[PDB]
From a paper:
The salivary scavenger and agglutinin (SALSA), also known as gp340, “deleted in malignant brain tumors 1” (DMBT1) and salivary agglutinin (SAG), is a multifunctional molecule found in high abundance on human mucosal surfaces. SALSA has widespread functions in innate immunity, inflammation, epithelial homeostasis, and tumour suppression. The first 13 SRCRs are 109 aa domains found as “pearls on a string” separated by SRCR-interspersed domains (SIDs). The SALSA SRCR domains reveal a classic globular SRCR-fold, with four conserved disulphide bridges, as described for the SRCR type B domains.
SRCR domains 1 and 8 (SRCR1 and SRCR8) were expressed in Drosophila melanogaster Schneider S2 cells with a C-terminal His-tag. The domains were purified by Ni-chelate and size-exclusion chromatography (SEC) and crystallised, and the structures were solved by molecular replacement. This yielded the structures of SRCR1 and SRCR8 at 1.77 and 1.29 Å, respectively. The fold contains one α-helix and one additional single helical turn. The N and C termini come together in a four-stranded β-sheet. Combined, the data from SRCR1 and SRCR8 are thus valid representations of all SALSA SRCR domains. Both SRCR1 and SRCR8 are stabilized by a metal ion buried in the globular fold. The placement suggests the ion is bound during the folding of the domain and is modelled as Mg2+, which is present in the original expression medium and in the crystallisation conditions of SRCR1. Structural inspection of the overlay of SALSA SRCR8 with the corresponding region in the other known SRCR domain structures clearly shows the potential for cation binding at these sites.
Author numbering: 990 to 1096
Amino acid sequence: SLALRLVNGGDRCQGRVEVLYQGSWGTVCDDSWDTNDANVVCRQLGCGWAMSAPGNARFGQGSGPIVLDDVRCSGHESYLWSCPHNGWLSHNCGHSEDAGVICSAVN
Ligand SMILES: [Mg+2]
């Protein structure tokens, strides 16, 4: 029912995090975004371990929905949406804060 991708990284294993929610791709706010969250993304995609969890539109800004904020993974989960989060749809954040990952399998 949900899906996850990275965009604008020049490689499938780094880029801006996007989640398909209710049929539309949205971004993730960087307010609580850390390497625990990035490790979950990298594992879910088959991309190894997280080298970094860059914020502030490191891979550009999205232009539509912002679907998650305040994501707080322990780091061991198998899907980003399985981590604790404050519901769906960010009412707090703008696209200046869109979150990214860089995974070890980048090549
Ligand atoms: Mg977090």
